[PDB]
Amino acid sequence: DVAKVMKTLDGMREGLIQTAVELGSIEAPTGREGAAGDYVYEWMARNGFGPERVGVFDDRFNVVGRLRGTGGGASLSFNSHLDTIMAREDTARFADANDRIYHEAWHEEGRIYGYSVVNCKGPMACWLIAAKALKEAGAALKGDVVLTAVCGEIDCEPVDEFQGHDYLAEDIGARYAISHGAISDYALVAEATNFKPAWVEAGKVFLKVTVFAGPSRYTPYVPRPVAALDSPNAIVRMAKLVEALEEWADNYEKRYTREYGGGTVVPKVAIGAIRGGVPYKIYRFPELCSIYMDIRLNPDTNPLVVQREVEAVVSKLGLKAEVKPFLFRRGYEAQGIEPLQNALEVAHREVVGRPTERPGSPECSMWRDTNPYNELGIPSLTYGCGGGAGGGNTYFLVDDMLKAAKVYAMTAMDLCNRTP
Amino acid sequence: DVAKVMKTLDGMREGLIQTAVELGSIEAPTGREGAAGDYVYEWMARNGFGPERVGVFDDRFNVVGRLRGTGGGASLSFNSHLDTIMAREDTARFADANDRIYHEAWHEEGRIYGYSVVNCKGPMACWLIAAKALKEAGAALKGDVVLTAVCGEIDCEPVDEFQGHDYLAEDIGARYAISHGAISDYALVAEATNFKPAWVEAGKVFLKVTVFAGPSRYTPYVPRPVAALDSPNAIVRMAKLVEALEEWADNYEKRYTREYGGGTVVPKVAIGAIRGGVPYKIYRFPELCSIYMDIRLNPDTNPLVVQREVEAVVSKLGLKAEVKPFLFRRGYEAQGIEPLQNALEVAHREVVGRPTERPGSPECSMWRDTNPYNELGIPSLTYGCGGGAGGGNTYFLVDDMLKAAKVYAMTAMDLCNRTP
Ligand SMILES: Nc1ccc([N+](=O)[O-])cc1C(=O)O
Ligand SMILES: Nc1ccc([N+](=O)[O-])cc1C(=O)O
């Protein structure tokens, strides 16, 4: 069998690239994934995978389709996300929000370009094609192959005045699709891991640290000189608190590094946002300033601890602040992952030509949709071509992309013909 | 301390009753919890718990407020749900959809009447008041008391053409509130358990069993006689398939009963809805009919197994059908429950007057929002007065409700002054 499907895949090298660019071209930042979902649904429908739209919202939804199998075999889920990182105008976070790389996809040489291709339509293109090859090559599987394309993968979260349809992400994402029928025995989340598989990822907790000072004064009355930490202007104390927290962050990752069978989890910290006062009434400095922190957790850390740590860092400075968490997610290590691990490995060795190696710590210390599957007892690991977008890589090598498709296919033929 | 708060609660017995009826009277079936959330938000705000609205939709949201503590202590979460079971016009499921009991609440004697009070504003009223007592009695707590009132508790799930805002429930419910900041060291879910605490609850999986027959014929051409199982009318084969599944259902609970520390899980089965063809074009019998089954799971059952079981029940009749699951949730047993269990137990003995006993199997075999807390590592158990609405009880005794408020208060006083 395996030789039939392999030759078949070489048949669709063009189809592989096209699907990637066509998908890559669609503007699909988190919050506008609908357009891409429609493309995949049609693509899936067109190929007889009989898709369904699972979603909280009618313009933000997941697509679940499946390649039915003869019967009595393990079922494997293939997963990737619809949304992309950069919106068309994200001038807040990028110095150059207009680079072509951020919002398009193209074939400039035996490689494919576009942040929207690396994350994450390139991998999705791969298993979409791999499923096509099996069906068209009429391969024999006893188990179903489930094709899950999800939305809201990326870590956008509502906070404060940003609530609802536009800001939601992972709550309406893969975990929704699963809890509403996209279940299988094992699941392979396809993302760029550089052909290295990982069965651990990290949780996270988001803290909104607000520091209090005051009292506000009309600028002609502001009192100086005063020590930074005793400033009445909360932006100034925040300045100090930011630098203390930056050192805490430096140590946090070292202390909480944990090595797992699945990978080595090095959980980092970052201050994603800050805001105090409003730009259109600055005549009075603000009595409070806020920062938004992204703290990663290894699978074994309780977020309440981390809050208390950050609470402590604040107390050491004699500041008065409110540390409040507005997001908490858990990271998991796969249990019972072996069958999929093994199936993947044989395929990998056959195609790539060498054993799989330990993934880099960053690839095991982030959020990937393996956590929802593992959360619900569907053993999951992540594996794909290219290097991580957060790295960040900007292209894929079509040969690599073609290899990944073979591995996905072979993994399926292997695993799906084993009885659970 | 404990006596100060106890005398205080007798101070607010009427407020206890008023709060329940006022809350019970609000029409708040799942899908319209908005009016009630607003009520609680203002109630919470009026009393200084500084509430916040956590929700996916602006008319369906959870309310989280908290009674701040001095510092360096464990924090305890109190939880109850806003929604009620029966909508004002639910003529589809109830023979008398107009009974006063289904949609209102009233104080007719030392007891309070109303399905909306038993499930679930009676308990919510209890701890809302308990929080009031502590604050008003200036009791000493080192840790926060978190007041979480949620929506989408009840098992309404979107399916088929019923998707979106109106049909969503627990996905936007408590698990949303927690994943977005309503975290504590421990959590107590207040519902009617008959003053027996349980820290295990059951999962569930929903299957849409669709059976195919045919071919369609205009009534004057329908062929008879034919055996039931060979009928062209898909409603007829379904009649046979329903009785097979009913016998499978009788056995399922016996085979899968499991005993846990938190309780004994007896997982039942039920066929909640059926529909084949449409009432406004009956001249042609339908080539397919569907039933929607609600299958509970003990925490250790894999939803994939139960599907194969039912797929089997179909295959044994030689029927061709499509068994597809459209909901899957997991049931959990609490881990690390001891501190709450004990804190609860001491209060119970003092107020109720005797040791606590094992809960009834139904109360451990359902869905309660303890599963979301436990899923995310917050040990949780459920305890409240009265007997379960699913039973279904139709009233609460004002005395028992007052006791339950005393227990909640005492639990908080104990637990919140322990350091984690
Ligand atoms: N899961 C991810 C989420 C976000 C980003 N990013 O760089 O914005 C990358 C990945 C990834 O898979 O590499
Ligand atoms: N959590 C529940 C959900 C539904 C129902 N019901 O009878 O429809 C009852 C309860 C309960 O708590 O007893």
User: Taking a C-beta distance cutoff of 8 angstroms, is the pair B268, B253 a contact?
Assistant: yes
Q: In what order do the strands lie in the sheet with B288-297?
A: B269-276, B288-297, B203-212, B321-329
Q: Which atom of ligand 1 is nearest to the CA of A388?
A: 13
Helix (H, G, I), strand (E, B) or coil at B362: helix
Residues 6+ apart with CB under 8 A from A45: A51, A65
Alpha carbon separation from A343 to A195, A258, A284, A400, A413 (Å, rounded): 14, 26, 64, 19, 9
Helix (H, G, I), strand (E, B) or coil at B249: helix
Instruction: Look up residue B71 and give its two tokens.
Output: 């510092």
Q: Which helix (H) or strand (E) holds B41?
A: helix B34-46
In three-state form (DSSP H/G/I as H, E/B as E, the rest C), the secondary structure along A344-361 is HHHHHHHHCCCCCCCCCC
Domain assignments of chain A as residue spans, ordered by start: 1-200+332-420, 201-331
Task: DSSP for B260-289, please give it.
Answer: -SS-EE---EEEEEEEES-TT--SB--SEE
Alpha-carbon gap, residue B319 to B236, rounded angstroms:
12
Nearest C-alpha neighbor of A268 from the set A247, A287, A249, A292: A249
Nearest CA in chain B to A168: B56
**Ligand that comes closest to the CA of residue A94:** 1
B chain contacts of residue A164, beta-carbon cutoff 8 Å: 56-58
**Which of B176, B330, B375 is opposite residue A171, by nearest beta carbon?**
B176
CB contact under 8 A, B183 and A303: yes
B335 CA from centroid of ligand 2 (Å): 24
> How far from the centroid of its chain's Cα atoms is residue A6's Cα?
30
Please report, to the nearest 10 degrees, the dihedral formed by the alpha carbons of residues A213, A218, A220, A224 taken in order: 0
Residues 6+ apart with CB under 8 A from A280: none
B chain contacts of residue A163, beta-carbon cutoff 8 Å: 53, 55-56, 58
Q: What angle do CA A136, A137, A138 make, to 5 degrees?
A: 85
Alpha-carbon gap, residue B191 to B112, rounded angstroms:
15
CB contact under 8 A, B327 and A176: no
Alpha-carbon gap, residue B303 to A179, rounded angstroms:
11
Instruction: Look up residue A175 and give its two tokens.
Output: 């975990």
User: Taking a C-beta distance cutoff of 8 angstroms, is the pair A342, B198 a contact?
Assistant: no
State which fold the B1-200+332-420 domain adopts: Aminopeptidase (3.40.630)
Q: B388 CB under 6 A from ligand 2?
A: yes
Handedness of CA A366, A369, A373, A378 (dihedral sign): negative
Cross-strand pairs, B292: B208, B273
Instruction: Look up residue B61 and give its two tokens.
Output: 């949201």
**Which of A75, A164, A328 is opposite residue B179, by nearest beta carbon?**
A328
Q: A85 CB under 6 A from ligand 1?
A: yes
Select from B61, B155, B176, B180 the residue whose CB has the most chain A CBs within 10 Å, as the one to mutate to test that interface.
B180
User: Taking a C-beta distance cutoff of 8 angstroms, is the pair A204, A295 a contact?
Assistant: yes
Nearest C-alpha neighbor of A303 from the set B235, B165, B359, B376: B376
Q: A144 CB under 6 A from ligand 1?
A: no
Q: A191 CB under 6 A from ligand 1?
A: yes
Strand stretches in A136-202, DSSP E: 145-150, 186-189
Alpha-carbon gap, residue A131 to A50, rounded angstroms:
13
> Residue type for B398, please?
V
Q: To which residue do tokens 């806003």 refer?
A: B82
B chain contacts of residue A168, beta-carbon cutoff 8 Å: 56
Tell which phi-psi region holds residue B337, choosing left (phi > 0), alpha (psi between -120 and 50) or beta. alpha
User: Taking a C-beta distance cutoff of 8 angstroms, is the pair B408, B208 a contact?
Assistant: no
**Which of A302, A325, A330 is opposite residue B181, by nearest beta carbon?**
A325
DSSP H helices, A157-260, are 174-179, 234-255
User: Taking a C-beta distance cutoff of 8 angstroms, is the pair A185, A75 a contact?
Assistant: yes
Nearest CA in chain A to B327: A180
Select from A53, A77, A159, A163 the residue whose CB has the most chain B CBs within 10 Å, as the one to mutate to test that interface.
A163
Alpha carbon separation from B43 to A274, B12, B75 (Å, rounded): 32, 15, 22
Helix (H, G, I), strand (E, B) or coil at A207: strand
A chain contacts of residue B176, beta-carbon cutoff 8 Å: 171
User: Taking a C-beta distance cutoff of 8 angstroms, is the pair A112, A181 a contact?
Assistant: no
> How far from the centroid of its chain's Cα atoms is residue B81's Cα?
8
Alpha-carbon gap, residue A274 to A279, rounded angstroms:
13
User: Taking a C-beta distance cutoff of 8 angstroms, is the pair A15, A131 a contact?
Assistant: no
CB contact under 8 A, A75 and B157: no
Q: What is the DSSP letter of B117?
A: I
User: Taking a C-beta distance cutoff of 8 angstroms, is the pair B149, B81 a contact?
Assistant: yes
User: Taking a C-beta distance cutoff of 8 angstroms, is the pair B240, B229 a contact?
Assistant: yes
Q: What is the DSSP letter of B119?
A: I
Q: How many angstroms separate the CA of residue B420 from the nearest CA in chain A?
A: 9
Select from A156, A160, A304 the residue whose CB has the most chain B CBs within 10 Å, as the one to mutate to test that interface.
A304
Q: How many residues appear in chain A?
A: 420
User: Taking a C-beta distance cutoff of 8 angstroms, is the pair B111, B397 a contact?
Assistant: yes
Residues of chain B contacting A, Cβ within 8 Å: 53, 55-58, 75, 157-158, 163-164, 168, 171-172, 176, 178-181, 183-185, 302-304, 324-330, 375-377, 420
> Residue type for B111, please?
R
Alpha carbon separation from B249 to A21, B255, B290 (Å, rounded): 50, 10, 17
Alpha-carbon gap, residue A388 to A369, rounded angstroms:
15
Q: How many CB atoms lie within 10 A of CB B352?
A: 16
Nearest CA in chain A to B312: A72
Cross-strand pairs, B210: B290, B322
Alpha-carbon gap, residue B1 to B360, rounded angstroms:
34
Q: How many angstroms separate the CA of residue B374 from the nearest CA in chain A?
A: 12
> How far from the centroid of its chain's Cα atoms is residue A43's Cα?
23
Q: A389 CB under 6 A from ligand 1?
A: yes
Alpha-carbon gap, residue A399 to A407, rounded angstroms:
12
A chain contacts of residue B185, beta-carbon cutoff 8 Å: 304
Q: Which atom of ligand 1 is nearest to the CA of A366?
A: 1
Nearest C-alpha neighbor of A367 from the set A382, A384, A386: A382
Alpha-carbon gap, residue A30 to A168, rounded angstroms:
8
Q: B28 CB under 6 A from ligand 2?
A: no
Alpha-carbon gap, residue B232 to B289, rounded angstroms:
11
User: Taking a C-beta distance cutoff of 8 angstroms, is the pair A156, A420 a contact?
Assistant: no
Task: Give the class (CATH, top level) of B201-331.
Answer: alpha beta
Q: How many angstroms separate the CA of residue A208 from the nearest CA in chain B?
A: 11
A chain contacts of residue B56, beta-carbon cutoff 8 Å: 56, 163-165, 168, 171-172
A191 CA from centroid of ligand 1 (Å): 9
Tell which phi-psi region holds residue B38, choosing left (phi > 0), alpha (psi between -120 and 50) or beta. alpha
User: Taking a C-beta distance cutoff of 8 angstroms, is the pair B260, B370 a contact?
Assistant: no
Alpha-carbon gap, residue B75 to B67, rounded angstroms:
10
Q: A343 CB under 6 A from ligand 1?
A: no
Alpha-carbon Rg for chain A, nearest whole angstrom, is 23
* Burial label, B322 (beta-carbon count in 10 A; 0-12, 13-18, 19+): middle
Handedness of CA B198, A329, A117, A398 (dihedral sign): negative
Alpha-carbon gap, residue B354 to B345, rounded angstroms:
10
Helix B13-25 / helix B34-46 crossing angle, nearest 10 deg: 150
Nearest C-alpha neighbor of A234 from the set A271, A194, A298, A289: A289
DSSP H helices, A115-269, are 115-116, 122-136, 174-179, 234-255
CB contact under 8 A, B181 and A326: yes
**Which of A163, A327, A420 is opposite residue B179, by nearest beta carbon?**
A327
**Which of B53, B56, B326 is opposite residue A180, by nearest beta carbon?**
B326
Helix (H, G, I), strand (E, B) or coil at B65: strand
B chain contacts of residue A172, beta-carbon cutoff 8 Å: 56, 171
Helix (H, G, I), strand (E, B) or coil at B4: helix
Residues 6+ apart with CB under 8 A from A33: A60, A61, A82, A83, A151, A152
Report residue B194: phi and psi, to 5°: 75, 35
Q: To which residue do tokens 């699972």 refer?
A: A54
A150 CA from centroid of ligand 1 (Å): 14
